[PDB]
């Protein structure tokens, strides 16, 4: 008996045993732990080549176990009904805290307790960066360690005191250390390898905004081309057909097809076949953020509308034509601004983003300063119709309207189909 080494369970009696769900799941000790909790069986383990052991009598448990883990770590753990039976209290941490002076003061107090000495400017910059991390304007990121790491970098780069300049330097260095992919992409665009036009007008071409699915999520425009040809009703998403589109992207393409089919009812099936292609893509596109971009591209291809290349169009669209919100709008807008700056700002570049992302715009200092000077624009739209009016610089209503031009284009394609079929008959 004198050779029994106590474990965590033994020194947790009368108190609390804090465990990580990752270790319980990974080490195969979840079953033994739940057996100790339910049956009160705690047997000190012994090496497998043991001569004998001690038949330890069942041991009543007087401890409280408080598992700590990521939601993904627990989703692998509620599959056992014994987990639901034993751990009845669920303490869940909100990923975000509301943005308010009370939470700013609480964050300042927490950082001061952590040892950092905050100036008012440094605390304000950290709180704004927390809101930026939360991607909201009325919510701040509840991941305090992330803010503590940023504060540590600011202290190192500023001399130990967290001023606004120090926090800005820390954030700039954080962006710059993982900026290699963006530097390579900008160099490729400038050299002409990846041809993106940030000035002028072209038909069927829209600078759709996509987010790189690795590293810090860098935004970058990806030119989208739509080609309207007479033929059977078919919305061909080249990336989806090639296998580069995910489930959500295929859903977005089908939704666009439904909107186009139901919007223009003056013939039978839609008299055009539209080919939507992300040029220079070569990667998997598994998101729904280009729906509006490819929708306005398809409409321009149908109607031969010269679309402005200054504006990058992003945001999902439903089949009633209304623009839905998308995530990581900051990354997309800032990436397009970077691409515009590399090629030179002409004072008319802009981004078209959903009206529902007014609360998700937390742009950097440079983008906001450019907006202030008018060298960069941000357009908020609620329906795809507004996006097309802003791109083509006209109005759907009235004569010489975009709607009438789209109708004329569809009429021409239907007449071409009619002529070919009548020539077949005659």
């Amino acid at each position: 008996v004198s050779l029994i080494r106590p474990g965590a369970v033994h020194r947790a009696q009368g108190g609390y045993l804090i465990l990580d769900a990752l270790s319980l799941k990974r080490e195969g000790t979840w079953e033994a732990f739940k057996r100790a909790l339910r049956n009160g069986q705690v047997e000190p383990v012994t090496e497998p080549q043991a001569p004998a052991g001690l038949e330890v009598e069942p041991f009543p448990i007087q401890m409280q176990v408080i598992l700590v883990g990521t939601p993904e770590a627990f989703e692998g753990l509620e599959e056992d009904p014994a987990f639901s039976e034993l751990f009845r209290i669920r303490a869940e941490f909100s990923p975000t805290l509301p943005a308010s002076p009370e939470n700013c003061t609480a964050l300042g107090g927490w950082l001061l307790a952590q040892g950092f000495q905050l100036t008012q400017g440094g605390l304000t910059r950290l709180y704004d960066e927390a809101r930026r991390m939360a991607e909201q304007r009325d919510r701040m990121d509840a991941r305090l360690v992330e803010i503590r790491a940023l504060a540590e970098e600011a202290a190192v780069l500023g001399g130990g005191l967290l001023t606004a300049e120090s926090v800005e330097q820390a954030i700039a260095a954080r962006e710059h250390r993982s900026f290699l992919s963006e530097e390579e992409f900008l160099r490729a665009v400038q050299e002409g390898v990846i041809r993106l036009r940030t000035t002028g007008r072209a038909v069927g071409e829209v600078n759709s905004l996509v987010v790189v699915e690795a590293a810090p999520y860098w935004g970058r425009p990806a030119r989208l081309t739509a080609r309207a040809a007479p033929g059977r009703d078919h919305l061909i998403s080249i990336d989806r057909e090639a296998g580069l589109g995910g489930q959500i992207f295929h859903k977005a393409v089908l939704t666009l097809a439904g909107y186009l089919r139901s919007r223009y009812i003056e013939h039978g099936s839609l008299p055009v076949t539209i080919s939507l292609a992300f040029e220079q893509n070569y990667v998997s596109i598994e998101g729904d953020a280009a729906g509006l971009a490819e929708l306005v591209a398809a409409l321009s291809a149908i109607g031969n509308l010269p679309l402005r290349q200054d504006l990058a169009v992003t945001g999902a669209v439903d089949q009633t034509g209304k623009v839905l919100a998308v995530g990581a709008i900051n990354a997309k807008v800032e990436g397009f601004f970077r691409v515009c700056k590399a090629l030179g700002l002409s004072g008319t570049q802009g981004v078209i983003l959903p009206e529902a992302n007014l609360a998700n715009l937390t742009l950097r200092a440079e983008v906001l300063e450019a907006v202030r000077a008018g060298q960069f624009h941000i357009y908020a739209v609620e329906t795809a119709e507004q996006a097309l009016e802003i791109l083509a610089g006209a109005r759907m209503e009235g004569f010489r309207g975009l709607q009438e031009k789209i109708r004329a284009g569809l009429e021409a394609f239907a007449r071409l189909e009619e002529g070919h079929d009548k020539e077949d008959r005659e």
Partner: protein, 98 residues
Amino acid sequence: MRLSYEALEWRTPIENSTEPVSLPPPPPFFGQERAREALELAIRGGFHAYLVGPPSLGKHEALLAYLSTQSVETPPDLLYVPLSERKVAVLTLPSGQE
């Protein structure tokens, strides 16, 4: 519609970047009334709880800081008693009787 700069500005204005501030420490689980209430219930009832949160939320540290403030009766000095040369059992005694 074109978004003006006023509707686009989000940064809270800075009226002074100097004069380092002194603020009281916040209570554990600040802004986390749900988790703090759940843990209050778990402590009060003795239930087994489990903390859930996206990683980097400092769940491990606030939880320890919150538990350190708690007060519990003196835990009994549990000890192994040999019921034979083959069988042992865990026996709990009041503090100081071991």
